[PDB]
Design a protein around this ligand. Structure first.
Ligand SMILES: [K+]
Ligand SMILES: [K+]
Lengths: 355, 355, 355, 355
């Protein structure tokens, strides 16, 4: 609720081309299809082939920033990005070579930041997941077995065996309900009374494990990525030790591109920002073009008013942001700091129109 | 658990008429329907047309409060509220003109406060949502493809192509289970063992993103809307800086209308309120009719007793509220404040019956 | 994880008889049923009728504790508990009179504590629920309408109207997937790609509203019910103001009945209790039978050892409880208190075997 | 996100053999199966029989550590692990004796730590669960009954009775949607509008009860298991009382086996560890092989750099771990401690290459 995320977070065309690239697949998969576009999409594969392949060698030119690096991840796919289609192109002469479009699916995961963020926490909490997965296997066959007890007599063709009932177990337990094979008697139907009761309680825990400290990591990602942009601020030499831990939980940093708007004049003053690198367009008669290490919004928060200037991104700015309460928290935290932001709420009034 | 929300939060008739207005649609959609009520409901459309249209120009009279305003939102629908039926009324001579009842659906969203509250946070956390949405697309075709590997031979008419299996993917992954096309072999049925395991883990995170800091915003909405009603209180000049951040998290403000009851006599004393504007009916022999900037309940909390008066809303009061613990927190927070609320628990005993 | 809940929390037989009472219904609902037990269960209704009716007048004897009471709730059903069967017994001469077994269903809700706990919070947060319910209605017909656009031509009998598609909306949106009427074309099937995405995000919020501050109330129920049992403790005159708010969050109170076990000897010392009313059986050669206002477990926690005595409930005791950390929190909180619990860890060593 | 869990948490072969042991069952359950492997898997049962039975007496040799123990749990299955197949082997001469493979399903639960962790909290919060379970039974028949009101006339064979509709209740309420028996009229279809609305709100609470303080217990498990490894540290005599409660919430302890890697050189310095028992391989020209009661990572955190050494597990080490923020919290918490970790960031620079 407090951030301006811009400049194409889904930026790199390495990621962009997997989506249209794999939709080329399906038309080959269909009978009675004209040969015209049949191969026209195979070009686009060759384009994406040639495109990453064009990009490939530039990546294999890893004499850029060549001091110490760990690029086993970023290279693990680019290699196979072109090899696997190639060997597929010859050995699998039939159209089945296209079935090696299971390969580009990692290219999103190549430059998927937020995917290592996922895999990080699984290596702390899987202790639970296994004991739950076991426990899921307990409840699975603990309950799947009681069905064969009953309808094997009058439903051989559906429940004349165990795994046919273990099939109906997870369908019955995992919220799904296909609707192929269902009991007819009473007591077998009684048993379902505890199943959905169970599995919704189980996954009530099990999937809960994921979001549990995943949020800790994302709420932690907002700190580790933002213990940076701390020393950059000229004013933050007085901040006590325990002060920052209270604060950086809320502070997120994002980048705005050049030409974009930052805060439009007259809209309700609801937030203030800290500039640390870039330049702005504080839209005034004399534009107060503030550079790395600046801020604005106290004019609108101490007064609780609309904006005093159509601030727009003159350049690509690495932005911070902050809503009132946590700044009211700061204004409540120390009288030493409100002195400057009092003067600032008088300097910027005259300094906005003037120079 | 601690608030008296009253006076028709779903107040404006601009919102009320969308619901019955769109139920006029369906009777036109049905064969063998008598022409009698067929057009009778078209009137009610013309009523809602004429009604907002009657309301319309009063809104286009925006010389009220005309200093600085941002009403691109509130006007964006009122314009089309009447135009779109109108052009639809003539060009689409057949009854299909009624199909432009997709238009009023924004009129709730016109005066839907809590809808901008939604859209505010999506512009901070969609970074995650995309990486998850990509990741959802990863897992989609990563898993959808393995089905065509198998049953294309003996299920052409169901799994003789890829998207027919991507169809069975999300139905299998997104908790649904329609039950149209399901495997027959073993290993294809083995694969589902991880799917519901996956998607319930995925949406365990993904929908978790929404409620994650959505609650922060709603728990924040309870502050930004209630840093107001702070200076109004005559007693709150002594409150230290860090005191309020502890408190305003819990304090919610709502309005009660005239004639309503506030706290009924003899019910268990469970809460105390702060009046800031309006008037009450403290039901006593001499009604102690307290106005803007008053409170009551300490009589019932310091003693832990039922109510001392059938307080009812003499007028429309902008109410605050507070349960014991957070006031016990206040009574624990400072001895300076319990002095007055000790006297108040003696003044109001005699002042209730007397003047 | 830290409490001994015993003495039949589902105690009153007023609640017990609704369950078997309503299972008497179904046998009447079935053809080809013998008249033998057909009316035998009607007796059990007459029993439950006569039983509450026997209990009834004792409740209508409300000259017990007749000072100030609010028993509109507890009486609202007992009245109709016997009247509604009675008027049903005569006017509805056919067996349909049994269909007034929709009446006892409130008798659980009569003496359902935890049900007012539910209804308390709905009167603070329904503001959200309506805006979401509206928003649910937005997304409902916003999406339901686009289906009639498509398959009305080739599916009249299923999608030849709007509400037939609004039917398929919530089934498609609310996680269910019956499997009666599903599209055949492409773009109509494309639309489902966002639906489960939506509704699982919606209910990801909407049902989240319930548990959101419901837990606040239950975590609050653990305080309001336990600001009692505070002054009872002879030692708690020194506890500072802000000390208790830290503590009572964790402290739960429950009752154990006479004859039950409290802590068995040799089991791992994992918790300590505060007796406030009742008596125990500290199983020793000289049983140190401690009465109202006592405690035990510091012997096992300061040493981190198994139990020093098979403490069992000599009588019905109103119990408190506490795990180590929060007592380690107390031992960390003040050196003034560990002095006594040091002596206590020496007195009770000799006082256990001796008197 | 901050722990190295290794050395086969799913270690004991007592647990390993239940999974393959029960998959021996199904082949017997199937007609037209050759007798060759039919009994070959019965051997593997006899193996698992003989295997635990071989393990059995070693467990019944409970003169190891025979001082005070509570092994009613660990023995409750081992006894029946071999007896139940045995009596089954003779009395049930037909192949049905295999149906006593419902017995090993507890053997995972025998040595399932994290299963008592489950059962611990159910004995505090089931108060809620019953009132919800009752309330679930309220809503069940409250809603199930209204269906028989309607379609009994034109759907006898599906809704000609009550429990046939209570069947359609939970299927309709518990998120499932089999798709066997669905209404045809309007008002009966209207009723579903509140059902999924309800049950998703109910289980929104009910399953929420599980994860609610289950996480408290797991977040508590991280303390009770880690108030140990406190006195072992030679430096922690100065830590104030309230300091540790802040810290041990995050600190998890796990064990790494011999031969494994701990932190690889050049990877981004993201965490520091506390050795308390074992030995390491700090890969340097002179390996600084640190033993019980050591730490490392401050070199990479105070500088925010990659690793200074390929530390690998020379032996099985009982590890602790800690990310920066909580150590930055420590560095912010006291200047007394950064003095040593300043010297340590100079000693270990020279002491790494040297001795
Ligand atoms: K379903
Ligand atoms: K289905």
């Amino acid at each position: 609720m407090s951030v301006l995320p811009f400049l194409r977070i889904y930026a790199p065309l390495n990621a962009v081309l997997a989506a249209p690239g794999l939709l080329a697949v399906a038309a080959l998969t269909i009978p009675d299809m004209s040969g015209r576009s049949r191969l026209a999409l195979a070009a686009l594969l060759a384009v994406i082939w040639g495109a990453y392949l064009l990009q490939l060698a530039a990546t294999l030119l890893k004499r850029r920033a060549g001091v110490v690096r760990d690029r086993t991840p970023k290279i693990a796919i680019d290699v196979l990005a072109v090899l696997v289609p190639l060997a597929a192109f010859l050995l699998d002469g039939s159209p089945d070579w296209s079935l090696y479009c299971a390969v580009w699916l990692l290219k999103p995961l190549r430059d998927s930041t937020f995917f290592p963020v996922l895999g990080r926490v699984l290596a702390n909490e899987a202790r639970n997941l296994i004991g739950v997965t076991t426990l899921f296997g307990v409840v699975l066959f603990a309950v799947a077995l009681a069905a064969y007890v009953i309808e094997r007599d009058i439903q051989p063709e559906k429940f004349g065996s165990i795994p046919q009932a273990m099939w109906w177990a997870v369908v019955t337990l995992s919220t799904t309900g296909y609707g192929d094979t269902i009991p007819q008697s009473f007591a077998g139907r009684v048993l379902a009374g505890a199943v959905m009761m169970s599995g919704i309680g189980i996954f009530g825990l099990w999937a809960g494990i994921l979001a549990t400290g995943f949020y800790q990591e994302v709420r932690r990602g907002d700190f580790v990525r933002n213990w940076q942009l701390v020393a950059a601020v000229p004013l933050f030499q007085k901040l006590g030790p325990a002060v920052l831990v209270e604060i950086v939980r809320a502070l997120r940093a994002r980048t705005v591109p050049a030409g974009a708007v930052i805060c439009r004049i007259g809209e309700p003053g609801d937030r203030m920002f800290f500039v640390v690198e870039g330049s702005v367009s504080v839209a005034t008669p004399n534009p107060v073009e503030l550079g790395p290490g600046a801020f604005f919004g106290e004019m609108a928060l101490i007064s609780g008013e609309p904006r005093s200037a159509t601030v727009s991104a003159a350049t690509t700015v690495s932005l911070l942001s902050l809503h009132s309460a946590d700044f009211q928290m700061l204004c409540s935290s120390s009288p030493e700091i409100a002195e400057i932001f009092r003067k600032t709420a008088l300097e910027r009034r005259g300094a906005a129109a003037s120079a």
